[PDB]
Structure formats: structure tokens, C-alpha cells
Amino acid sequence: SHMQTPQALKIIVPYPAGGTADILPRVVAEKLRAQFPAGVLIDNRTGAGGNIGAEAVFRAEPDGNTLLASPPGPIAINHHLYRKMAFDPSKWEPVTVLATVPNVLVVNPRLPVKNVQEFIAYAKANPGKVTYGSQGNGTTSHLTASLFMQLTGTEMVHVPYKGTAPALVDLVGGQIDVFFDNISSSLPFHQAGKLRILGVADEQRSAALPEVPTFAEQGLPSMNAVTWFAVVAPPGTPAAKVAALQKSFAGALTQPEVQQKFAEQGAEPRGWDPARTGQFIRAESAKWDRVIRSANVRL
Numbered sequence: 001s002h003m004q005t006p007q008a009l010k011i012i013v014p015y016p017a018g019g020t021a022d023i024l025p026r027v028v029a030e031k032l033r034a035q036f037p038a039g040v041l042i043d044n045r046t047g048a049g050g051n052i053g054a055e056a057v058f059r060a061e062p063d064g065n066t067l068l069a070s071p072p073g074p075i076a077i078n079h080h081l082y083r084k085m086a087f088d089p090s091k092w093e094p095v096t097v098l099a100t101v102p103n104v105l106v107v108n109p110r111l112p113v114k115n116v117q118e119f120i121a122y123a124k125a126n127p128g129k130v131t132y133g134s135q136g137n138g139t140t141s142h143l144t145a146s147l148f149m150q151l152t153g154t155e156m157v158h159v160p161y162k163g164t165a166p167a168l169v170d171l172v173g174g175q176i177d178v179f180f181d182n183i184s185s186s187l188p189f190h191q192a193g194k195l196r197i198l199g200v201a202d203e204q205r206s207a208a209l210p211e212v213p214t215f216a217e218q219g220l221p222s223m224n225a226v227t228w229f230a231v232v233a234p235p236g237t238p239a240a241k242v243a244a245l246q247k248s249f250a251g252a253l254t255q256p257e258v259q260q261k262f263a264e265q266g267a268e269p270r271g272w273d274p275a276r277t278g279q280f281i282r283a284e285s286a287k288w289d290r291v292i293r294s295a296n297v298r299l
């Protein structure tokens with residue numbers, strides 16, 4: 001029979017532990033363990049911008065027991081930018097979006113600038129010398145830095161990492177000068193005074209950090225850059241399986257503790273149905289491609 005095999009749910013996060021990509025699915029997984037009695041196991045599988053872990057899910061059996069929980073790179077973005085691809089992201093089977101989260105500009109608290117305009121001047125004063133970390137080539141932090149440079153006429157050197165976690169280590173350590181992270185992973189550091197967020201790349205401020213202005217409020221209205229964390233299944237996963245999984249994830253997102261934890265970090269829980277999720281990924285893929293084009297995004 002089917003029912004007599006307990007099967008674990010395996011969720012690959014294709015980025016190092018401790019960033020938002022890792023934290024949000026782990027928070028949610030605590031509320032799914034009851035429905036997957038053989039266990040919910042998150043594995044962090046790093047490399048190639050998120051494409052190593054992504055490929056591993058892509059090639060797994062399309063039974064819904066192996067899923068990718070990822071930010072946009074290996075779902076919507078990197079196939080527009082990379083020299084090659086070992087899988088076809090257009091064939092992901094969308095399950096849901098766990099959260100959307102705005103990106104920010106974050107610096108070390110010793111950087112002698114108080115706001116975005118002063119940061120621009122610092123970059124122009126030290127042209128080609130100021131370095132920006134990223135979460136990897138083709139991640140939203142990469143493209144967000146690029147959009148910033150496009151809109152401001154600045155020239156900064158890209159230093160890609162494997163994800164948020166090692167980038168934040170180096171920004172704290174002073175080994176990079178700026179990072180366009182999402183708010184959720186940078187907020188604890190900002191609150192602690194360990195890092196300093198200069199602006200939020202959205203049309204409104206975050207309720208989690210209400211005193212930090214948007215980029216629009218600082219003279220850069222087109223500096224909008226919002227990431228997200230989706231769940232996708234291998235190509236060919238049945239529609240009713242995807243639907244059942246989306247209902248399980250959506251149910252987790254509404255649980256009070258998951259709501260508290262997402263809210264305190266400025267992550268907006270979504271839980272969108274598979275169709276809406278697929279429409280969103282399509283629209284996002286094109287939106288980020290339009291950034292690649294307008295901002296001359298370079299590997």
C-alpha cells in the first residue's frame with residue numbers, strides 16, 4: 001500500500017544555515033512535523049548560487065517527499081544570468097511562497113556615513129575600492145546592489161559569498177563595506193548595534209524597523225527590491241500533491257508562534273496557493289530579468 005510507508009519530508013535549503021533562507025523554513029517545519037511522522041529534515045546544501053541544492057531537488061522523485069525551500073536565485077533569477085544551467089527552473093512545480101521580505105542596505109557601524117546619500121558620496125570618493133558582499137551570483141542581494149549602482153552612478157566591487165551568513169560575518173569583521181541583505185537577517189544585528197541599516201528598498205517602511213527610511217524617502221524612488229522564500233517541487237509532481245503540501249504549509253504559517261517569529265523579523269507570511277505562486281514566480285522572473293538588463297548585472 002501507499003499508507004504503510006512512512007516517508008520523511010526532505011526540504012533542501014540551498015544556502016548556509018542561519019540566514020533567512022534557512023531560518024524561515026525551519027520555523028515552519030516545527031509545525032509540519034505532526035503531519036510527517038517519519039520526520040521533517042532540512043538539509044543545507046550550498047554552492048553555485050543555490051543551484052547545487054536546487055539541482056538535487058530537481059532530480060529527486062516527483063512524489064512530494066523532496067522539496068526545495070529557496071529564495072529567488074535558483075527559481076526565478078540565475079537562469080537569466082548564468083553561463084549554463086543543469087536544470088530548467090521553468091519546470092519547477094510551485095507549492096507556495098512562505099514569505100516576502102524587503103532588501104536593505106547594511107553597513108558596519110564604523111563606516112562614517114549616516115544615511116544613503118552619505119554612502120553614495122563615500123562610494124564616489126573611493127571609486128572601485130568599496131566592496132559589496134552578496135549571497136552569491138544571481139541572488140537578490142547581487143541584483144539589488146547592481147540596481148543601486150545603476151540608479152546612483154556608483155562603482156563598487158562585487159564579493160560574492162555562499163549566502164547571507166558568511167557575508168554578515170565579513171561585514172561585521174569589516175572585510176566588506178556594504179551588503180544589500182534582506183531585512184530579516186540583518187534586523188537582529190541592526191537592533192543590537194552590530195550593523196547599521198541605512199535604507200529599506202520598498203515603497204513603505206518596515207513595521208519591524210519603523211525608524212529606518214525607505215530609499216524613496218531618501219531620493220531614490222526606483223530603488224525597490226523585495227525578496228521572497230518559496231517552496232517548489234520537482235517537475236511532474238502531481239497537482240493534488242502540490243495542493244496538499246501547500247495546504248500544510250499555509251496552515252503552519254497561520255499558527256501564532258510562526259506568525260510571531262516572522263513578524264518580529266519583518267518577514268510577511270504569505271501561504272499563496274499553487275496557481276498564485278506560479279504566476280508570482282513568472283512575474284518575478286521577468287521583473288528581475290528587467291533589472292539584469294537595466295543595471296548591466298555582471299557575474
Ligand SMILES: O=C(O)c1ccc(C(=O)O)cc1
Binds near residue numbers: 022135163
Ligand atoms: O537571493 C536572496 O534574496 C537570498 C539569498 C540567500 C539567503 C540566505 O543565505 O539566507 C537569503 C536570501
